[PDB]
Scaffold this active site. Structure first.
Site, PDB file in Angstrom:
ATOM      1  CE1 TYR A  22      30.443 -27.634 -17.961  1.00 19.87           C
ATOM      2  CE2 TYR A  22      30.192 -26.008 -16.191  1.00 19.87           C
ATOM      3  CZ  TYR A  22      30.884 -26.489 -17.299  1.00 19.87           C
ATOM      4  OH  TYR A  22      32.010 -25.815 -17.751  1.00 19.87           O
ATOM      5  CG  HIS A  99      32.562 -20.186 -11.446  1.00 19.90           C
ATOM      6  ND1 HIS A  99      32.535 -19.781 -12.744  1.00 19.90           N
ATOM      7  CD2 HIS A  99      33.396 -19.296 -10.768  1.00 19.90           C
ATOM      8  CE1 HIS A  99      33.305 -18.667 -12.880  1.00 19.90           C
ATOM      9  NE2 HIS A  99      33.842 -18.380 -11.672  1.00 19.90           N
TER      10      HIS A  99
HETATM   11  O1  LIG Z   1      35.586 -21.151 -16.430  1.00 12.96           O
HETATM   12  C1  LIG Z   1      34.986 -22.218 -16.343  1.00 12.96           C
HETATM   13  O2  LIG Z   1      35.626 -23.291 -16.192  1.00 12.96           O
HETATM   14  C2  LIG Z   1      33.616 -22.225 -16.425  1.00 12.96           C
HETATM   15  C3  LIG Z   1      32.999 -21.904 -17.634  1.00 12.96           C
HETATM   16  C4  LIG Z   1      31.604 -21.928 -17.671  1.00 12.96           C
HETATM   17  O3  LIG Z   1      30.923 -21.614 -18.814  1.00 12.96           O
HETATM   18  C5  LIG Z   1      29.590 -22.169 -18.725  1.00 12.96           C
HETATM   19  C6  LIG Z   1      29.482 -23.424 -19.346  1.00 12.96           C
HETATM   20  C7  LIG Z   1      30.554 -23.984 -20.036  1.00 12.96           C
HETATM   21  C8  LIG Z   1      30.397 -25.218 -20.659  1.00 12.96           C
HETATM   22  C9  LIG Z   1      29.188 -25.897 -20.598  1.00 12.96           C
HETATM   23  C10 LIG Z   1      28.124 -25.342 -19.907  1.00 12.96           C
HETATM   24  N1  LIG Z   1      26.957 -25.990 -19.849  1.00 12.96           N
HETATM   25  O4  LIG Z   1      26.729 -27.473 -20.667  1.00 12.96           O
HETATM   26  O5  LIG Z   1      25.879 -25.408 -19.132  1.00 12.96           O
HETATM   27  C11 LIG Z   1      28.273 -24.103 -19.284  1.00 12.96           C
HETATM   28  C12 LIG Z   1      30.889 -22.274 -16.527  1.00 12.96           C
HETATM   29  C13 LIG Z   1      31.513 -22.589 -15.332  1.00 12.96           C
HETATM   30  C14 LIG Z   1      30.739 -22.947 -14.222  1.00 12.96           C
HETATM   31  O6  LIG Z   1      29.591 -22.443 -14.073  1.00 12.96           O
HETATM   32  O7  LIG Z   1      31.163 -23.838 -13.431  1.00 12.96           O
HETATM   33  C15 LIG Z   1      32.896 -22.568 -15.285  1.00 12.96           C
END
Ligand SMILES: O=C(O)c1cc(OCc2cccc([N+](=O)[O-])c2)cc(C(=O)O)c1
Ligand SMILES: O=C(O)c1cc(OCc2cccc([N+](=O)[O-])c2)cc(C(=O)O)c1
Ligand SMILES: O=C(O)c1cc(OCc2cccc([N+](=O)[O-])c2)cc(C(=O)O)c1
Ligand SMILES: O=C(O)c1cc(OCc2cccc([N+](=O)[O-])c2)cc(C(=O)O)c1
Ligand SMILES: O=C(O)c1cc(OCc2cccc([N+](=O)[O-])c2)cc(C(=O)O)c1
Ligand SMILES: O=C(O)c1cc(OCc2cccc([N+](=O)[O-])c2)cc(C(=O)O)c1
Ligand SMILES: O=C(O)c1cc(OCc2cccc([N+](=O)[O-])c2)cc(C(=O)O)c1
Ligand SMILES: O=C(O)c1cc(OCc2cccc([N+](=O)[O-])c2)cc(C(=O)O)c1
Ligand SMILES: O=C(O)c1cc(OCc2cccc([N+](=O)[O-])c2)cc(C(=O)O)c1
Ligand SMILES: O=C(O)c1cc(OCc2cccc([N+](=O)[O-])c2)cc(C(=O)O)c1
Ligand SMILES: O=C(O)c1cc(OCc2cccc([N+](=O)[O-])c2)cc(C(=O)O)c1
Ligand SMILES: O=C(O)c1cc(OCc2cccc([N+](=O)[O-])c2)cc(C(=O)O)c1
Lengths: 141, 141, 141, 141, 141, 141, 141, 141, 141, 143, 141, 141
Positions: A22, A99
């Site tokens: 991320y 995403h």
């Molecule tokens: O469905 C997914 O795999 C998913 C979930 C999702 O939930 C947000 C999220 C999930 C786990 C960790 C974080 N984060 O440490 O910001 C954010 C985000 C994203 C994305 O933005 O690529 C994708």
């Protein structure tokens, strides 16, 4: 012209963990990049985050009334929430699904989203820049 | 810094038969648009289109061997070709998969891509700006 | 009034084994059998075979630009090419899909077709006469 | 030579509904042109229709006993009835499945047929003419 | 002591006609066999055959009201018919489902029965004697 | 104003069967309940029950030609009959599917209906009451 | 003729649990029952049980070498063992699968059997008398 | 009787947008309507809406404490929520599930309900009148 | 005898990347090895590679008319091409499928092949010595 | 030096049934073929058959403990046994899976193997010779 | 007060393999740990290991007769063995299922158990300590 | 040494019904019980329950930020929430998933868990003891 940027569950955690996947930018800093990028494109971006599905629906409802564009990253709700999908189906301005990570390179269950069938488009895997690219799409339309 | 824009089967027919789902812009016009965006962005782009899988692969290998980033709209091949995917997997530079239409709003077989899992990210439904945004993403990475 | 008959992969092997599943008429004999027969109906048939999906795509494009009907026996590609189905969906004149054997009495995978949903209709299991009956439908629409 | 044309449930309603998928020809009109086309080939056409599964099995048995060819459009029962399938398995002369509408462009469940695997051939989506082409094939064998 | 033996569609054509995996015994020879045996055992068998679901249901409601055992060979209806199942669920005397052939050694879709779960038991693939064995079960229960 | 109430296979035995699944009211008191409560609403209810599919189709055909509303409880055929679905699709006045039991709290196969997708609305699991409720909707439209 | 009755896993527990499902008479009682009943029919029965797949296979091979029929109740292994299917597949004399309980009335995984497609036939649900009815079959062939 | 009529996500948007599916009536018009009819039947209707699952369960729980009946239109949560299902599962008074739209006539995903199995009955696709008919059920029982 | 070694898509890239899996020998080296090994065995091997399905089809047709053995690594075409399969189905001399990597150890879709069912045998995951063992086996017949 | 060749359920009945699915050689003849063949290569093959899962596990464990390669034709167990798969995961020497017949040409259930994924490689449909070419693979990779 | 601790296939290899998936502790050290922990809780643990299904069924039989509790770690059989499920279904005392590793974190096939539905409960991924914790449940009941 | 005991939706209704499956202990009692038992083990237990997913996540987010162990029974959210799974995935201390009832002995859908794969271990069906046992595991880690 106002654009709504809406982040769902877990996005508040941005840059506080999993820097590989991320990235290391925090939510707060992302709000700032998006407002800056927005301004330089003649747009006004309201960026909100919530871990709450009700609150997200509220916001979607409000954009539907104001007729504003929405860039929506719902995190986990993408793959599970039919209610979100229904609230977004009511939007007459564009809806750009975003995403940060490449969901297709992950668990099978992440490869499906209830939102994309009702979205104008979807930007997946381009990191934080997917938001700014999604703004460029809107400034251009 | 050269970016490789590669389009698969049927994309030569852009703008001709079929509007509505794929936009009004032709493949000639899109070529001109990528040339202009490339310049603004300060890089070069080589746009190539072919109905033949073997041609696409040959282009992909060359990109692989020149360590050049690829923007790829494989058209119907996205859904069926493991061969294209294996060719793409070699790419040491970023790979951006692009679709003009929102494949998530069409026949259900279009919601699986064999390329998405090995790409950097994917842009879908943003019409022809799909390509331009992707170039911009590469200008920043 | 021109009619395009288009034969895909392995169909140039007609008459060289399998006795059996496919009849004993070679691809040349068929070509001319179609031509004589289109003629006695006031049609002009262009009969063409290729093992190259790319070549078939170019043929379909032309038929599409000329608003001419097509008789397509895609061979193997019927079960596998989304690109071929996209090229065909473009035709505005009638599209008839043809199989020589009865695909429904063979391997399960041969029972699904990417083409059938976009053809005017499909003839299976009538052997070589299937092409002639498609001409007949075209002569009358 | 005598050929039996057997229409199953709802074929009674032909040309009185959705016409617009099934056509504007009535069941009576069909019988008429079936019977003229029979004449032109030296065949006798016995055209029969019923909403009842048992009636259709009965007609099927008598054609099995007589060794006469059958052209069958079982309507709805095509997708659902094994008994009908077990009935036609016994026919020693050719069996042609006919559907008026192209069943691969409608609902998924319309795409499976219990009768196709055991039939000589299948003609789909050529409308009323499907019947006439089925007769023409029988003439020639 | 009354046992009802009820045969479903296509059974009226035992070894005539279809011999085949069903024997050389005609439905008439079978009625006699089952009668001779049942009498040999202190039961009265009534044996009825019909190609008609509505007729079968009628027969079964009557055995429910009379509370007499049923040995049922539903034929194709075994695999497709819920109404028949629901009819048989109200039988309070034993229900034995019988198939002359081994339905498990054939097509996939025969390996599922709507009746088996509500039958007392099932005999399959032991031919004509299927019925006789069933009687001998009933003569003990 | 005429309403056709139609009951399919096994409903003849209502209240001669499983109390507290379908409950102790017989078919005849149901008819009487339906006819009284229909008049109270200034409607004429014609109620019929048949275990024969072809007989149900005949009735549907009739209500289609007369353009009358249909309340249908198709029994087992609900889960099995494309023919019945094909028949009801032609109805230009409302079609209301009623099941006495809650089909969703039973075997899995009972949870699928061929009819619902083509019906105005569905009432499930409210007992016999559900027929009167259906009348009540129609009275208003 | 010598008949092999072979009992699989958990069958030595007969009559010492689940008398509701499996009956009440012990494996010993069963051995003597079958023995006596085979004598009355002119056969010699050798009946063994084992919880060991290796041993059941050993006995099956032996049956294969001697060309003796088998009455097999594989118990649990019915649903799970390819090795057992393979061994049984080699028997040139008839083989009857027997289950004491109505497997189609229990958990879904019980309705699949690797053995059924290679048996001569199957008896299910008739309690202990299944073994004896299968004796009675073999006595005729 | 107090009856709790509970509406889930997006139902607050009734009327506003948009009425080929769902009708012209606003959420408040509906409160008024459910109230009058409840009164005219001798019941007190408490009618509340929330986009919030937690809020929805808080209301179900309360209804479960007071042993009051619930009419529930959970919107999208019908299709996705086990928590909602588990909350309803402890109601002693009836639970009627209501959908204004006919859920069987739309996306495949809508045809599944975690709720239907634990409701007494379900009313789908009768519109706003759906709530009144459920109210009438409760009045009679 | 002449043996035909036919490598499809992405196999010219051998050794020039992803060595963990393919591993280190280039296609030229592989050509030499195969020839040295074929001559040491008393065979003449013709090694040919191409990214073009239609080119692969052509080489098989030739081996079919020549009645020559074929060693085939179709690459990604293995999991995708009905066309390639149908062409090999025609070979009268033995057909060995080879894969350098263990396909059962990787992505799920690589686990299925359309060639395996029609091939004499398959060698998987023994790396490059796969080809040599297949030659070894052909020398033996 | 030493290669274990282990055959699962029913392989003891090789060539007593359906030749030309399997075809005409008996298991004992197969034992001779492999042993002579492995010796010409300068290796020592120990060949064993059992219908008993537990005995095959036992043999696999000792191969694992002796760091010796296994050539394995698990027969029926190929498709059904997770116990076997897990014993096999623990071999670090090479594991070659063999099948006499072409399993892809037969019933669908035969086309899935719990063992292929943890095996070095798989040889299928080359008859009795499948074992011999597996030996030659080991022989060519003697370090 | 006796507790049977039964380990299945491969579990004799504990700690002599993957110190990371199963811990460093051998089977012998485990037997010591369990018997120790069981004493200070006031129980007698009998810990047994076998690679043989028949031996496992045997032990289970005995606990069923002794009416003793069981802590079962079936190993690979957990996922594949009806015979063992059927043996355990007999027990009258608690049955607790134990897996050292978190089977949900591994291959999909590892996520299904025939044992779980008939166990008192299941403890997974807690290492060797799972067994001691199961002892605490049995001490308390 | 602080331990977060987090309880999901419907878990506030413990003891206030369904005692057959969940026990007769109420939520408050569970809290006191857990707090007192953790203290004997020299832990500080923070027990919290909410029907709000947003709330549950906040709690997970805080545990992640403090690197505190977590015991989680997400109740219904177990089978449906990817959001929660993702909150949990960042716990760097242990996560024990706990269910009071045996989920594998109940509806199909309860046997799938989003949380299980990312958890250290799971305890299922050991009643309220499950929580206690989870504290003992954490006592040693
Ligand atoms: O469905 C997914 O795999 C998913 C979930 C999702 O939930 C947000 C999220 C999930 C786990 C960790 C974080 N984060 O440490 O910001 C954010 C985000 C994203 C994305 O933005 O690529 C994708
Ligand atoms: O099946 C697809 O996903 C697909 C196919 C596809 O085929 C390319 C195409 C391009 C221009 C015209 C047509 N056409 O006239 O059928 C087809 C394009 C695209 C896309 O860019 O969204 C997607
Ligand atoms: O016309 C067909 O029925 C047909 C032809 C077809 O091309 C195969 C083929 C055609 C003509 C001859 C041969 N042959 O002699 O090896 C093979 C494929 C398929 C299919 O995959 O379902 C169907
Ligand atoms: O189930 C089908 O796919 C189907 C059913 C089917 O049932 C007959 C039918 C159904 C609905 C309306 C009519 N009609 O107006 O003749 C006829 C016919 C046809 C067909 O001939 O294409 C196809
Ligand atoms: O679909 C079946 O499995 C089936 C159908 C079935 O229908 C009756 C039937 C079907 C085909 C031929 C005959 N016949 O005339 O012997 C009878 C019978 C039997 C049976 O008794 O084994 C089995
Ligand atoms: O399982 C069904 O789909 C089904 C079957 C069904 O078959 C009719 C029927 C079956 C068994 C008994 C009766 N009856 O009570 O006479 C009627 C009825 C109903 C119903 O109205 O809820 C539902
Ligand atoms: O003969 C059967 O019906 C039977 C027996 C069988 O062996 C289980 C068993 C048999 C006899 C007694 C017991 N028992 O008292 O635990 C258990 C399994 C199965 C099956 O898996 O469907 C079926
Ligand atoms: O997903 C559903 O089936 C669903 C969702 C659902 O959410 C409410 C809703 C969804 C979308 C728009 C509105 N609305 O603008 O009234 C309301 C309602 C209904 C219904 O009562 O038929 C059904
Ligand atoms: O994915 C496959 O099925 C596959 C593809 C496949 O395509 C050839 C290939 C694919 C990707 C890279 C290379 N290469 O760098 O030699 C070669 C080969 C093999 C194989 O030999 O096991 C397997
Ligand atoms: O899974 C299979 O189909 C299978 C079973 C299998 O079990 C051994 C076996 C099965 C049936 C007959 C024999 N035999 O005559 O040795 C042996 C072997 C083989 C094989 O080597 O191809 C394949
Ligand atoms: O495949 C399984 O799910 C499985 C198999 C299994 O079989 C025993 C086993 C398999 C592989 C290695 C070992 N070991 O050396 O403990 C034991 C054990 C366990 C477990 O305790 O979590 C899980
Ligand atoms: O602790 C559990 O096993 C549990 C609890 C849980 O919350 C349900 C619940 C808990 C306590 C009381 C009630 N109730 O009185 O309806 C319901 C759900 C689930 C589940 O989805 O499998 C499991």
């Amino acid at each position: 012209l106002i654009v709504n940027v809406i982040n769902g569950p877990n996005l508040g955690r941005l840059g506080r963990r999993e820097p590989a996947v991320y990235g290391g930018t925090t939510h707060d800093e992302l709000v700032a990049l998006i407002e800056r990028e927005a301004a330089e494109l003649g747009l006004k971006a309201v960026v909100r985050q919530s871990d709450s599905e009700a609150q997200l629906l509220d916001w979607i409802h409000q954009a539907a009334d104001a007729a504003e564009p929405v860039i929506l990253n719902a995190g986990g709700l993408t793959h599970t929430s039919v209610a979100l999908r229904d609230a977004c189906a009511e939007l007459s301005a564009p809806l750009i699904e975003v995403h940060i990570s490449n969901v297709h390179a992950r668990e099978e269950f992440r490869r499906h989203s209830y939102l994309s069938p009702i979205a104008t488009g979807v930007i997946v895997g381009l990191g934080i820049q997917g938001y700014l690219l999604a703004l460029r799409y809107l400034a251009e339309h």
